[PDB]
Design a protein around this ligand. Structure first.
Ligand SMILES: CC(=O)NCc1c(Cl)cccc1Cl
Length: 124
């Protein structure tokens, strides 16, 4: 049950996504870039990602671990850095702040999960 629960990350990620949706800094990243509206986005970005898509992937059970979820979130930020590379851009600054917030909060989720894995493997 509760110590080393290998499923506890799911609720922890739901809670973190809730915080992220509350942040004004997430506003550009909540929904997919409108590919019909914004022409050259696909010329630049191979794999779009956004927080609504991550939140639905989680709700759907399609992440095997919090590291898979983290990979998709990191793609949100790497896509922004590629599309909006200037340190002068306020959008760049938003992405930087929100990335730092995410990386701060996800740290403990991943470490806790990996510790759970190691314990269960050791005692299996
Ligand atoms: C999510 C993201 O990279 N948005 C940047 C953007 C802005 Cl600010 C304005 C028009 C189109 C785009 Cl794609």
């Amino acid at each position: 049950s509760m110590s080393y629960d290998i499923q506890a990350w799911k609720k922890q990620c739901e809670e973190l996504l809730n915080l992220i949706f509350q942040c004004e800094d997430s506003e550009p990243f909540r929904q997919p870039v409108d590919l019909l509206e914004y022409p050259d986005y696909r010329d630049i970005i191979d794999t779009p990602m956004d927080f609504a898509t991550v939140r639905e992937t989680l709700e759907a059970g399609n992440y095997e671990s919090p590291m898979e979820l983290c990979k998709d979130v990191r793609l949100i930020f790497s896509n922004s850095k590629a599309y909006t590379p200037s340190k002068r851009s306020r959008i760049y600054s938003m992405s930087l702040r929100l990335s730092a917030f995410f990386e701060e909060h996800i740290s403990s989720v991943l470490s806790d999960y990996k510790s759970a894995l190691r314990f269960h493997k050791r005692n299996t």
